[PDB]
């Protein structure tokens, strides 16, 4: 586990596009990053993507946000222009069918700018 995490986290230090490097790695069958911080929650939340408290519905799990951020986990520079991570200090809801790879889910999807639900997994605009 730790040896395996250390491997993919090492790999995304050898690349100019860590997001693509991670997604290409897991798409080719590489082991997703483990040891994400899954919370226990009353599955009675709003279901939005990113939230100051856990907001998981019955169809989601909530993670501590830093732990599902590739840039935090790999200790590399965040791509956001403001420099501030979008997840760290917050909670991230993941559809329950995607809990095998929370980091890959996060790198592959985008909260809706209007309703802040995941596009394709909640956003109904």
């Amino acid at each position: 586990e730790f040896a395996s995490n250390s491997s993919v986290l090492s790999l995304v230090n050898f690349t100019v596009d860590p997001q693509k490097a991670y997604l290409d790695f897991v798409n080719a069958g590489g082991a997703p990053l483990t040891n994400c911080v899954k919370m226990l929650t009353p599955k009675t939340g709003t279901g939005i993507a990113i939230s100051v408290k856990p907001e998981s519905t019955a169809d989601q799990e909530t993670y501590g946000g830093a732990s599902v951020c590739l840039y935090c986990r790999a200790h590399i520079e965040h791509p956001d222009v403001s420099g501030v991570c979008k997840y760290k200090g917050k909670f991230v809801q993941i559809p329950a069918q995607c809990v095998r790879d929370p980091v890959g889910f996060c790198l592959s999807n985008t909260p809706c700018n209007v309703c802040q639900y995941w596009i394709g997994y909640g956003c109904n605009c």
Binding site: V37, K38, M39
Partner: protein
């Protein structure tokens, strides 16, 4: 049975008043393990149960609440206890965490290194410590009071803790401090809380609730640790996480506890009573500055 649905067990005054020699701690389920609900980290369950017990205590819960979390790294490079604190605390609470080696965390401020390198410039409202020194496992002679990181924590209580503030500091059979027990006598109330998730460990969180800055209870710390072990040796505790099955009231109550600046001489009976009920904090209301030195 109700015990299983509680988050854990708190040392009762029945054992606080005993007078016994310090004995070996012998737990009938020692090191038995319980699988974790949904396979979250064990520290998720442990911190949640600590928080649930603190929900029953008279914690002061102000705006911009100042929380420092020591020993916050675990599980090879992450901080599940910090994320539980983020789930528990008010959204405007400030969490500072710290551990010896690098880790990733949801705290507002994360500092690496010995806890001694953590310079608290102001006073804080809540101290959580999960620190434990590995050398404590090298049990040779008799079980004596330890210095280690407790010296730092004792000084922090005496200088960097708001009146009305509280502390939850992990101890074990062999990881403990006479001086820290004796400082519990400067709080309105104190106990040791043992989670049900880790009931099979001599681990307990030494709780100081509402710091008064003056001695309320005269405690002999060596004797009190002998009483803590006597309590553990006397008290069946079955592993359990049932308390986490209903999380609807988990979050810390939004008490809006006021923060007042007061001179020592102005502290009277009314102020001590408010501090002891979780209804007041006394400290600076500057901007908090906590850095590596």
């Amino acid at each position: 049975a109700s015990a299983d649905w509680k988050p854990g067990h708190a040392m009762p005054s029945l054992f606080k008043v005993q007078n016994v020699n310090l004995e070996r701690c012998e737990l009938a389920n020692y090191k038995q393990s319980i699988p974790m609900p949904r396979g979250v980290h064990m520290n998720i369950a442990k911190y949640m149960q600590l928080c649930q017990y603190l929900n029953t205590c008279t914690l002061a819960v102000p705006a911009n609440m100042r929380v420092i979390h020591f020993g916050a790294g675990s599980d090879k490079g992450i901080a599940p206890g910090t994320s539980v604190l983020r789930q528990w605390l008010p959204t405007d609470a400030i969490i500072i965490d710290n551990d010896l080696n690098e880790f990733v965390s949801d705290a507002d401020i994360t500092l690496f290194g010995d806890c001694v390198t953590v310079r608290v410039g102001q006073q804080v409202d809540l101290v959580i410590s999960d620190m434990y020194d590995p050398t404590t496992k090298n049990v040779t002679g008799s079980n004596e009071s330890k210095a280690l990181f407790f010296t730092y924590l004792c000084n922090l209580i005496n200088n960097n803790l708001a009146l009305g503030g509280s502390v939850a500091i992990k101890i074990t059979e062999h990881s403990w401090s006479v001086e820290l027990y004796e400082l519990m006598g400067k709080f309105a109330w104190w106990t040791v809380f043992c989670t049900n998730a880790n009931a099979s460990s001599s681990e307990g969180f030494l709780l100081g609730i509402n710091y008064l800055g003056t001695i309320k209870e005269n405690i002999d710390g060596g004797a009190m640790h002998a009483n803590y072990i006597f309590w553990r040796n006397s008290t069946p505790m079955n592993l359990s996480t049932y308390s986490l099955f209903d999380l609807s009231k988990f979050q810390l109550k939004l008490k809006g506890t006021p923060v007042l600046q007061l001179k020592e001489s102005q502290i009277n009976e009314l102020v001590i009573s408010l501090l002891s009920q979780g209804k007041l904090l006394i400290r600076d209301n500057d901007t908090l500055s906590v850095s590596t030195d």
